[PDB]
Amino acid sequence: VSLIRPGAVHRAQGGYLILDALSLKREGTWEAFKRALRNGQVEPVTEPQAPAGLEVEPFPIQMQVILVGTPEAFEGLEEDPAFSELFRIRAEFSPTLPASPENCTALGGWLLAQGFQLTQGGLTRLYDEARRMAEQRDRMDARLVEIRALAEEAAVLGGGLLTAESVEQAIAAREHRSFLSEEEFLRAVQEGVIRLRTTGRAVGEVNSLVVVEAAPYWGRPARLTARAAPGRDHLISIDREAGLGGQIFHKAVLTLAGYLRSRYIEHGSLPVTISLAFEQNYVSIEGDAAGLAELVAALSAIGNLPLRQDLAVTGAVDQTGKVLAVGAINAKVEGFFRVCKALGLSGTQGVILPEANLANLTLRAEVLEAVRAGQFHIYAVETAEQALEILAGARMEGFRGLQEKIRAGLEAFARLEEGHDKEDRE
């Protein structure tokens, strides 16, 4: 008995035992802990090379247990009914807090209690950066460790006082320390190694804003190209249906095919095959979403529509044509601005982004400064038709509108199919 050592369970009696859910899942002691909680059966771990052990009598538990863990750690733990039966209180932290003067005051007080010297400008800049991390104009990031880390860096760069310039310099340094990938991309674009088009108009080609692989997901434009051929009603995504992906539709090809087959009907089937391509292998396209850029590129390819290359197109669409919100809108817009500014702004560049992301547009000082001077534009579209109108610069319905040109292109492809069938007949 004298060689029995206490664990966490034996020294939390009459108090609180705080564990980590991730630790319980990782170390494989969740079952033993469960049995300790329900049956009061806590017993010291016995080495398998000992000849005899000690039959520890079951111990009634007077402690209460508080697990701590991220939602992903508990979704793998809530599955068994015993967790729901035992842990009945869910203290859930919201990832975002309301962005309001009361919360600005609370954050300032919290940072002052953490041991920083703040000014009004520094606190306001930290508050706006909290919004920016939350990627919402009405919610601030509740992750106060991330805000404390930023404040610590700002204190180091400012010598101890967190002025607005100090926090802005800290934010710029944080952006720049992981800017190597974007620096490489801009250098390649300037050298012409990676060729993009931020000026003029082109057919079947549009700058689709995508995100790259990094801890700070960096946005950048990619030359998305759609090319239309006469054939069966079948859309092919070479990046998504590469190789073994031929069987599997990823719900993105089906969405675009559904929109195209349902919207344009003068023929009993879609008489075109659309090929969608992304330059190089940095795009890493998610299958589950069908981009608005893909749809407008396909429409331009079908209808021979010169789309503006000034405007990068981002956003997801469903088969109705309604433009869906996309994540990381800030990264995409700022990446396109970086590419345009490297090549030199002309005054007509811009981004077509969903109206649903209007609430998520928290942009750096430079983008808003360009918007002030009119050297950069942000277009909010609610339907893919509006995005196509903005890219091609004309109404869909009118005199020689885009709809008529799309009908003409589909009719031409159908007549080519008819000619092929007539050739096969004879």
Partner: protein, 98 residues
């Protein structure tokens, strides 16, 4: 439609970058009324609770600060008693009689 600068401006204007401000400490779990109330219920009732939230929210920091301000009677001295050479049981004695 083309978004104007006025619609895109999301930053609160800075009154001044000087004149350092002094502010009162916020209450525990500021802006986290749900977590605060769940913990109030858990400690008041003695239920086993679990805190869920994105990492780096300082979930551990508030939780320890909240529990440190809590008060309950002195935990009894628990100790292992040998019922035999092989049988040992966890026996709880009142405070100070160990």
């Amino acid at each position: 439609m083309r978004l104007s600068y006025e619609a895109l401006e999301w930053r609160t204007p800075i009154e001044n970058s000087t004149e350092p401000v002094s502010l009162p400490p916020p209450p525990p779990f500021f802006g986290q009324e749900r977590a605060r109330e769940a913990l109030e219920l858990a400690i008041r009732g003695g239920f086993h609770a679990y805190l869920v939230g994105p990492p780096s929210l300082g979930k551990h920091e508030a939780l320890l600060a909240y529990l440190s301000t809590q008060s309950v009677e002195t935990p009894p001295d628990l100790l292992y008693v040998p019922l035999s050479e092989r049988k040992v049981a966890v026996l709880t004695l009142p405070s100070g009689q160990e």
